[PDB]
Ligand binder design. Structure first.
Ligand SMILES: *[C@@H]1O[C@H](CO)[C@@H](O[C@@H]2O[C@H](CO)[C@@H](O)[C@H](O)[C@H]2NC(C)=O)[C@H](O)[C@H]1NC(C)=O
Ligand SMILES: *[C@@H]1O[C@H](CO)[C@@H](O[C@@H]2O[C@H](CO)[C@@H](O)[C@H](O)[C@H]2NC(C)=O)[C@H](O)[C@H]1NC(C)=O
Ligand SMILES: *[C@@H]1O[C@H](CO)[C@@H](O[C@@H]2O[C@H](CO)[C@@H](O)[C@H](O)[C@H]2NC(C)=O)[C@H](O)[C@H]1NC(C)=O
Ligand SMILES: *[C@@H]1O[C@H](CO)[C@@H](O[C@@H]2O[C@H](CO)[C@@H](O)[C@H](O)[C@H]2NC(C)=O)[C@H](O)[C@H]1NC(C)=O
Ligand SMILES: *[C@@H]1O[C@H](CO)[C@@H](O[C@@H]2O[C@H](CO)[C@@H](O)[C@H](O)[C@H]2NC(C)=O)[C@H](O)[C@H]1NC(C)=O
Ligand SMILES: *[C@@H]1O[C@H](CO)[C@@H](O[C@@H]2O[C@H](CO)[C@@H](O)[C@H](O)[C@H]2NC(C)=O)[C@H](O)[C@H]1NC(C)=O
Ligand SMILES: *[C@@H]1O[C@H](CO)[C@@H](O[C@@H]2O[C@H](CO)[C@@H](O)[C@H](O)[C@H]2NC(C)=O)[C@H](O)[C@H]1NC(C)=O
Ligand SMILES: *[C@@H]1O[C@H](CO)[C@@H](O)[C@H](O)[C@H]1NC(C)=O
Ligand SMILES: *[C@@H]1O[C@H](CO)[C@@H](O)[C@H](O)[C@H]1NC(C)=O
Ligand SMILES: *[C@@H]1O[C@H](CO)[C@@H](O)[C@H](O)[C@H]1NC(C)=O
Ligand SMILES: *[C@@H]1O[C@H](CO)[C@@H](O)[C@H](O)[C@H]1NC(C)=O
Ligand SMILES: *[C@@H]1O[C@H](CO)[C@@H](O)[C@H](O)[C@H]1NC(C)=O
Ligand SMILES: *[C@@H]1O[C@H](CO)[C@@H](O)[C@H](O)[C@H]1NC(C)=O
Ligand SMILES: *[C@@H]1O[C@H](CO)[C@@H](O)[C@H](O)[C@H]1NC(C)=O
Lengths: 192, 149, 444, 150, 50
């Protein structure tokens, strides 16, 4: 359960766990993977097979409102469940500053992963910082990170009848802009 | 950037008896180069430190592996070839060489993995020894002629 | 059976009977509904450099520090692609910002809209056609499931043990279904008015009369044949949801996009089994048998070449994203022009004379249902360019002059309906002698 | 004058034209598997038969950086050309005439457009007709007077 | 292009095409000979330009 460099006649530094009922022909120690990798090493004097897993697995993301506004952040751990974060990122071997982003009260579970550092808000707003799966975050009011759910638009209803029509009685003239790029810079390169 | 290993785990087999080095390096006599002999080595614990205060090697060259890494390695098919030549012919015991030794007496393969060890043994071997001077063709790697007249 | 070789056939052979006084005018029509599948977005991928190259190796990680501009460059190149996929969906589906409520009654003057609108009884919030479309196209695996199953080594776990991952889209399928439902309800209850301002209601028979008037057919034809037109539309909405159950090749483009999103990450995983001129493709074998001054030389040969594989993957992803963006732009233009209005461009919204279109949500794409007008039964007639009565030529205002054999009438071009030639139907320009092919008749 | 984000696309084009030449400059300080990234340090301490195999390791890799820059430049020009084609079509159809295509020239019913020059781009001012104040009425599809429908 | 082919004597078709651009169809019937001569001349002097 720790990041360890192992030496079963070969050097590699990973996390070692207990393997399941793996098939071994009583002749091999590691075997071979599809990407020419050696996985699930065998203890050389016993028959017990172990597990080789990278102890830095998956990607993490950091949500910030800008350094000139604040210095607090939120961490999104993709494709893991909440209350499995400290096992996934090996929180016992990290600094105490890193340990406060592995648990607590501001824990929210989305379809993009567990998000820690923002308390959930039941209101709906427009998207400020997109996170994924319909979840956006912002910096709202003393301020904090809100991590709400996005709103598609205003709700309306049309009164339909089989003898009814709406006809405008006035109008207005509107002028709007549209910006389109045309050309870019002309660069030249001398090889020598 | 947040995680780093801190301690080391090493697991090795149960072999415990030392490997016979004086039986090979300090044998009573050595064969001729045209009649070289091969010996298998198995169930050993190979530590080269025990020869430090008794031997002196003029040549120690390894191929496919680096020296000072043999301490922490496990081998499977260990074999030893012993013969006796002149002092100036040690340079011909190498993959891809030429000369009277490299093609008519003893030839190494191109994908050779192992080490070559040599040392001078004057005042120990006094008898007459033989070698192949010419042949109709060249020897294949790890092959022996073993014939006369 | 055997393999045969032949010359391909271009099409059916046909010939048109041309005469200088002859015209063909249709006497009947039909309503046809056709599909069109356009891709919108692809999968968003992210790559970790050190995890792919030398994950869990401090020696190569220290060696992978002269480089790093390349890795941040390719990371920002891949990040630019992933931001465009959400913009494509936003530009295609989020055209309007008024979530119009689904009407309680799905019948509008005999036209049945039940199959393209959500029903409150079913638990899912999408239409029957969308439910059929979502099953024609075939990841989010977690740690613990990957470790718990090594007896079956799937490709997704091998990708995630390197630095390759796939990010979820911003908009879920429920939001896309809500957007399509709002668009369908708006185009069913207000027609075309909500695309250029506030929605104005219309009883959908007068809207269909206006749409018939837009293609050159007078609006009394629809009011005369409303029951037959509604029956044809309901029959054409049917026998296309049963074509999505038996036939399994209509969604080929989206399946091709999905299959090309895969098998490029798989080749990136399998490209790690290459020496690139080194003694081994495994870093542990190099590090366990060579001293660091010699091991650095062999590690650099793997680094230069794993970087090459990553660069090749990024370049191909950019090239694919360009054509995905082009398809998304075409889909957005089609949604703005075929759904929010009536188009006069030939073969832009289906084949025939365009009436209206409906969008349906598909995985990584959109499906349009184009409703068109097709003339069916033509007949031979004798025509004249002009009629002169008292030395003055008369020309039709809208339509052509036809003769059934004895008398002369004037009818519209796309539907046979003869009327009496009066002075309201014609206008006077010149004399009889300046027109080639003029005939003698009387104007009431 | 107050809002400073309406011209973000041209500024993005300018910022992407930059910072790709800057990364090409900063990539010169890379060893590419050699003893040094400076050619003078290699040439001042090694004989030519040795130093050739170290100069080659820099040449292969500086060529790689140049090839990568050329490829990204071609890919960016591929979409700049499409944007320019759309701008030319909009100039031909929204300025020199009146278009019936929905939402092609602004939102609403198009009246006319005016072009304005911008750095590395063009700005269109679309004039449109927007109906504002609707009212309920009772309608009928047709009226018949003496047994004949109107 | 939108169904089965329906024949037309190509003078009424040209009159319809003239009506499509905002010109009344009597202009075509008044100047048919001049328009046909102009079309034949424009079909000429473009093959010799090739
Ligand atoms: C349509 O709206 C315009 C304003 O947009 C109305 O014009 C105003 O008319 C009032 C008197 O009714 C004047 O006091 C205002 O000065 C006018 N405003 C402007 C900007 O000219 C117009 O009357 C409305 N039309 C209808 C039919 O209601
Ligand atoms: C080289 O070193 C070895 C290891 O210490 C010596 O071998 C030991 O010698 C002592 C006497 O000095 C004996 O009592 C031990 O039994 C020997 N041990 C073994 C394991 O053989 C050896 O004598 C040294 N050789 C020389 C020439 O000094
Ligand atoms: C192995 O033995 C064969 C004979 O069994 C050798 O072939 C001879 O090669 C010489 C080369 O000059 C010829 O003159 C002989 O005629 C060959 N003999 C026969 C029977 O063909 C062969 O050279 C030997 N050595 C090797 C390395 O293959
Ligand atoms: C209109 O009349 C033309 C002839 O004036 C018809 O064309 C003929 O069709 C028959 C079908 O059996 C063929 O055998 C003839 O060869 C055709 N004639 C020519 C000159 O091509 C045409 O079918 C008629 N159209 C309709 C709709 O009845
Ligand atoms: C166009 O053709 C259709 C299909 O043949 C006609 O509809 C048929 O009308 C008859 C009476 O005339 C009914 O008995 C049939 O049941 C109808 N068929 C269907 C499938 O509904 C239609 O009348 C024709 N239209 C015109 C204007 O002539
Ligand atoms: C629109 O079509 C649907 C689908 O055919 C009709 O719904 C069916 O109606 C029949 C007759 O009442 C029922 O037996 C089925 O169970 C219904 N199916 C579903 C899926 O709801 C619907 O009635 C039609 N709408 C009309 C005629 O207004
Ligand atoms: C036209 O009439 C409809 C139906 O009465 C109006 O819609 C109502 O609007 C009021 C506004 O307070 C709502 O409280 C009702 O619930 C609506 N009724 C329905 C059935 O939706 C509509 O506002 C009228 N339009 C105009 C322009 O006056
Ligand atoms: C994560 O939690 C869900 C329920 O929210 C469960 O179905 C799933 O198996 C869990 N995944 C694990 C433990 O890897
Ligand atoms: C917020 O929504 C959740 C989920 O429906 C609900 O349990 C909770 O009571 C809500 N809180 C408030 C303050 O409305
Ligand atoms: C031999 O292997 C066994 C395996 O159970 C182990 O317990 C024991 O310690 C080993 N003996 C030595 C001397 O290493
Ligand atoms: C090795 O051989 C020599 C003679 O060559 C002999 O004197 C000596 O005792 C042997 N043993 C050792 C340990 O040197
Ligand atoms: C043509 O139509 C008129 C008016 O209905 C009718 O009297 C006449 O018999 C028709 N002629 C033919 C040949 O059908
Ligand atoms: C049509 O062609 C016939 C010969 O086929 C000719 O007699 C007649 O004058 C032509 N009519 C017109 C209007 O060109
Ligand atoms: C039409 O009527 C005029 C005037 O009576 C006559 O000169 C001419 O020949 C007639 N044309 C035909 C085709 O009958």
């Amino acid at each position: 359960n720790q990041c360890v460099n192992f030496n079963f006649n070969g050097l590699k530094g990973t996390g070692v766990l207990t393997s399941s009922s793996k098939r071994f022909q009583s002749f091999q120690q590691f075997g071979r993977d599809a990407s020419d990798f050696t996985d699930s090493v065998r203890d050389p004097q016993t028959l017990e097979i172990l597990d080789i897993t990278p102890c830095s697995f998956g990607g993490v993301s950091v949500i910030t409102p800008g350094t000139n506004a604040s210095s607090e952040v939120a961490v999104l751990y993709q494709d893991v469940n909440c209350t499995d974060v400290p096992t996934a990122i090996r929180a016992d071997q990290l600094t105490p500053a890193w340990r406060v982003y592995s648990t607590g009260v501001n824990v929210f579970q989305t379809q993009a992963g567990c998000l820690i550092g923002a308390e959930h808000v039941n209101a709906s707003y427009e998207c400020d910082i997109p996170i994924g799966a319909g979840i956006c975050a912002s910096y709202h009011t003393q301020k904090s990170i809100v991590a709400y759910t996005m709103s598609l638009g205003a709700e309306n209803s049309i009164a339909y009848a089989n003898n009814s029509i709406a006809i405008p009685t006035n109008f207005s003239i509107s002028v709007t802009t549209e910006v389109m790029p045309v050309s870019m810079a002309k660069t030249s390169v001398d090889c020598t | 950037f947040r995680v780093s290993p801190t301690r080391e785990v090493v697991r090795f087999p149960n072999i415990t008896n030392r490997c016979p080095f004086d039986s090979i390096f300090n044998a009573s006599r050595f064969p001729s180069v045209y009649a070289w002999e091969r010996t298998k080595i198995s169930d050993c614990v190979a530590d080269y430190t025990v020869l430090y205060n008794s031997t002196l090697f003029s040549t120690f060259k390894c191929y496919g592996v680096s020296p000072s890494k043999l301490i922490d390695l496990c081998f499977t098919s260990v074999y030893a070839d012993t013969f006796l030549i002149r002092f100036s012919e040690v340079r011909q015991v190498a993959p891809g060489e030429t000369g009277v030794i490299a093609d008519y007496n003893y030839r190494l393969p191109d994908d050779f993995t192992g080490c070559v060890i040599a040392w001078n043994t004057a005042n120990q071997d006094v008898g007459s020894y033989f070698y192949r001077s010419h042949r109709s063709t060249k020897l294949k790697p790890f092959e022996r002629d073993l014939s006369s007249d | 059976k055997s393999i045969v070789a032949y010359t391909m056939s271009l099409g059916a052979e046909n010939s048109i009977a041309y005469a200088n006084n002859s015209i063909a005018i249709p006497t009947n029509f039909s309503i046809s509904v056709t599909t069109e599948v356009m891709p919108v977005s692809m999968a968003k991928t992210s790559v970790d450099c050190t995890m792919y190259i030398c994950g869990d190796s401090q020696e190569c990680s220290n060696l992978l520090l002269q480089y790093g501009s390349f890795c941040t460059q390719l990371n920002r190149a891949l990040t630019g692609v992933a931001l465009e996929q959400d913009k494509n969906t936003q530009e295609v589906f989020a055209q309007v910002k008024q979530m119009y409520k689904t009407p309680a009654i799905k019948d509008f003057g005999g036209f049945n809209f039940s199959q393209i609108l959500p029903d409150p009884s079913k638990p899912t919030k999408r239409s029957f056609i969308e439910d059929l479309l979502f099953n024609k196209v075939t990841f989010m695996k977690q740690y613990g499931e990957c470790l718990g199953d090594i007896s079956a080594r799937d490709l997704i776990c091998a990708q995630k043990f390197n630095g390759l991952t796939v990010l979820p889209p911003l908009l879920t399928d429920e939001m896309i279904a809500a957007y399509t439902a709002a668009l369908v309800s708006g185009t069913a209850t207000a027609g075309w008015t909500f695309g250029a301002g506030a929605a104005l209601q219309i009883p959908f028979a007068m809207q269909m009369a206006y749409r018939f008037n837009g293609i050159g057919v007078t609006q009394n034809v629809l009011y005369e044949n409303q029951k037959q037109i509604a029956n044809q539309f309901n029959k054409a909405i049917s026998q296309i949801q049963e074509s999505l159950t038996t036939t399994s090749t209509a969604l080929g483009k989206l399946q091709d996009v999905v299959n090309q999103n895969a098998q490029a990450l798989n080749t990136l995983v399998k490209q790690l089994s290459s020496n690139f001129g080194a003694i081994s493709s495994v870093l542990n074998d190099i590090l366990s048998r060579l001293d660091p001054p010699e091991a650095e030389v062999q590690i650099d040969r793997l680094i230069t070449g794993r970087l090459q594989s990553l660069q090749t993957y990024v370049t191909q992803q950019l090239i694919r994203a360009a054509e995905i963006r082009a398809s998304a732009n075409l889909a957005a233009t089609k949604m703005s022009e075929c759904v929010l209005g009536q188009s006069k461009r030939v073969d832009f919204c289906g084949r025939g004379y365009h009436l209206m279109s409906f969008p349906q949500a598909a995985p990584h794409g959109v499906v349009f249902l184009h409703v068109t007008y097709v003339p069916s039964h033509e007949k031979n007639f004798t025509t004249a360019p002009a009629i002169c009565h008292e030395g003055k030529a008369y020309f039709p205002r809208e339509g052509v002059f036809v003769s059934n054999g004895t008398s002369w009438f004037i009818t519209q071009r796309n539907f046979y309906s003869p009327q009496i030639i009066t002075t309201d139907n014609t206008f006077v320009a010149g004399n009889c002698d300046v027109v080639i092919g003029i005939i003698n008749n009387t104007v009431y």
